[PDB]
Symmetry: D2
């Protein structure tokens, strides 16, 4: 109904429906505009993608609050009445003060939700901090969203599986739940059985499945994830990866054959249309221009 109400919209989807919320991972204006064009009900802003696109760098804690907030603020608000945005917030970019600032900035920027992880600050796409230090992050985040009277959906992410194992992950999610996290994310399942098991272990508290295209986790389909009981599923590299493959293929053709060769329906005007040309023309015409 109201503009900039992504958090309320996501919260409604989570609490008022049983649907699996499918969130394509977007990383810039073009990828986000394309997801919106196609009618996705929620979007996900990847940190890895944001770093690659906005900074041309690997996902090694190089993007910080300013870059992440700027990208999320841009994407969340392309349409003030558009789909909610879940955004990576990494480790919160510092201690509790920075976690709170991050949540506050995301909330202000119309971001619907974000995932906060237990990696050491010098993180990567892997060591984690203590359970207690993780919970300091979660507490700082929850207190902020409450202080701000926001419906912001905080997703507690654990990267502990690799180094600490399943039980530890489940216990961290349970602890995070108690501190006020709204959704859990056990990063990098090793098997589909294990994914269903984590859902069962934490039910009825909602989980989010992070599908990493061409990564090191099992390929789980949307229908498989829904049947498993997941409530959100994000697709981290859903746009960055095909963008790279296409850009590379095209530039190789340009290099070797002196032509770009992009299907002719992809015109500048169509691109502008995807990126809000109509809205802009309406503004201009409406203003008496």
């Amino acid at each position: 109904d109201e503009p900039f109400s992504g958090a309320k919209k996501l919260r409604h989807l989570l609490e008022n429906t049983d649907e699996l919320i499918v969130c394509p991972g977007v990383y810039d204006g073009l990828s986000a505009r394309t997801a919106m064009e196609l009618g996705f009900k929620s979007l996900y802003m990847t940190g890895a993608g944001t770093t690659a696109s906005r900074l041309g760098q690997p996902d090694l804690a190089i993007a910080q609050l300013h870059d992440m907030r700027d990208n999320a603020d841009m994407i969340a608000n392309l349409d003030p009445f558009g789909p909610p945005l879940i955004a990576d917030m990494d480790t919160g970019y510092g201690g509790p003060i920075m976690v709170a600032r991050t949540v506050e900035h995301y909330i202000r920027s119309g971001v619907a939700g974000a995932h906060l992880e237990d990696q050491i600050l010098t993180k990567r796409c892997k060591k984690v901090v203590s359970r207690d230090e993780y919970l300091v992050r979660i507490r700082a985040a929850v207190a902020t969203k409450r202080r701000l009277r926001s419906d912001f959906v905080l997703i507690a992410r654990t990267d502990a599986l690799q180094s600490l194992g399943y039980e530890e992950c489940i216990e961290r999610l349970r602890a995070a739940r108690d501190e006020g996290a709204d959704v859990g994310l056990l990063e990098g399942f090793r098997s589909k059985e294990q994914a269903a098991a984590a859902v069962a272990a934490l039910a009825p508290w909602p989980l989010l499945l992070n599908s990493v295209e061409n990564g090191h986790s099992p390929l789980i389909t949307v229908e498989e994830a829904k049947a498993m009981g997941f409530r959100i599923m994000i697709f981290s590299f859903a746009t960055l990866a095909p963008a790279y493959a296409a850009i590379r293929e095209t530039l190789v053709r340009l290099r070797d054959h002196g032509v770009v060769g992009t299907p002719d329906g992809i015109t500048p005007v169509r691109l502008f249309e995807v990126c809000g040309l109509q809205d802009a023309m309406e503004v201009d015409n409406g203003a008496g221009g």
Copy 2:
């Protein structure tokens, strides 16, 4: 030889060789990193692409100095010893004071060159200002690059063909040349004959051909452009367009079939490798980490 010497490198290519300098149009870190991966000798930063990707908006004078400089600064310097970057600088983002500031900022940011046009400030991918007002822009730009003792390659772009015709375009380029522009860009040729004619009219002053993929200008190949006498050729939508087509195709598959389906060789690690993973690991390992 030296880091951040893109301007010198481009200048050398222009003055010390007869090669057609082929510049794929890039718009973010991923597109730029891909062009670099493939060994292009010079890159072009599109304004339309920058606006679509960094802002999710159409090319309607929405991106301003800060966005354009930030993107160019990022791209030009991904490799301090990398290929020169020619960047769109639109109309200079204001009067002479802003044109000068823009050139100064681009120069400081390691940008090798930029094209400056005669469109009215409220520009678009079309009305132009008077010849005199255009020359005020060119003069402000040239004086700046000279004041800064820079090899910065200033490209004088004219969008006058549409509304004023060929002769007017040629005269504006001649005037711009005299004010100190290094290269001319007659935007949007209507025919290959006309493109060769503009080159002949301004010889031996170098021209740059702007190829717009799927646009409204004749399809000219690299070999055709070289034979015509052009010295630079940029490919405005060379990466933005195929990126869109691929992202869209992928998201449609995700929407309809619940899987992303990106060829499996495009892994997160490969993407990180393209985006400077090795450099980063070298830094960390080298620092005793």
Copy 3:
């Protein structure tokens, strides 16, 4: 009551009270934090000050949307429950598309209101555009705040007095009023009589008096302005000017006598306290840190 409700708060002050709303002109975090420390009920973000502080440049259309929005976003939200912020929005930074984007960004950023002027885009602290072109700006701005269902207070500023005279100013304000502006600002009165006259001419539509410290307009006190019927009074250079005088005096002492000599009660900790140390410590302590 609610966080980020500056627009509602300003609107309430305007519509629900007869008080003269006194807004000290602030330009950075320190000046804003000081105004807040002292209990001002509303703040004003100067464009000239923003340009001097964030960019080190004169008020010559050098700061653009990104700089202005970033500064306003920072200041408005230092306290989510703090005083409303009226921010300079100059000419809207472009055509109607940019005016709308500017208003949209200010609204999103919690800004309570802004003044929009009729200067030519290449403005200064003086030529104005036609009445019709001005109204295109106003219309774009009003349509945006309505589209966004916002209480944003749009102040229509006219700089026409200098070149066009009083009657023209009054007519522009009347026109702006009809297009939906909430408050009028006749910039640079020449006399106190003329200021009272403009109020009378537009009553009961509220006016805002812009007091420029050490400028070329009559010195009007708060009590004088209230008696004249003004509803808002901003103090453009209220913090930038004394900051400069003090910084200069201090640096001269440092240069000549080798000591800074700042009264000893102005400690780093006091400065941190003014700039939100307590809030930060509360966050950290509260998070279990």
Copy 4:
């Protein structure tokens, strides 16, 4: 001689003279422009000041690379031929990858030098990391400035005195020296005797004295510091503190008496003059405007 050669200029002052290099601490465009107006030969950009002014926050690791680089880039380049800028770089904003990125960005931005400290990432205006972890930072920084063939002056700062004592500080500086730091900074001396002692302990390797106005370190005059053997002296709060006192005094007067009362010589035009009005007018006039 050449534009953007702050690093070379600072390096020359350090290596080719025996003068104490006096650097007033500046934090925005106005403070920097004032220091330049008065002829200081080098400027210092305070992190605390940058955080207070650009962010309105306390010096608690809230400003990150983007804010710090943006401020330093702005200040260093107000005059391409102006005085060198030494800028706070805190802990490097992350692990070795971020330290290197920070140094690279500062170098690109014309920054002459920077101090890098051994505080834990969650720093403050106090715990320090291990000697080895500190040296990882220093190594990353030195390798970067070398890779970039830059004269950048790296200042190794130690905050270890408080928790670890004098000997530890001296040993860290010696280690940092060996890893390639150009200057040492023992933060927060407890006595003048101890300051002279640190200089003697590290001679002939240059030290920098950080004078914190109204802080918890002894008041040392410029002449005292020179006699002690220091080669650089920075004045952290030299402009932020008097700015606050003046802004506060003024706003209190405005609040209580309805007038600003700033000495009348501090006009908008004078402020614009201090902030580069002449340069701007020269650009405009020169461009044929």
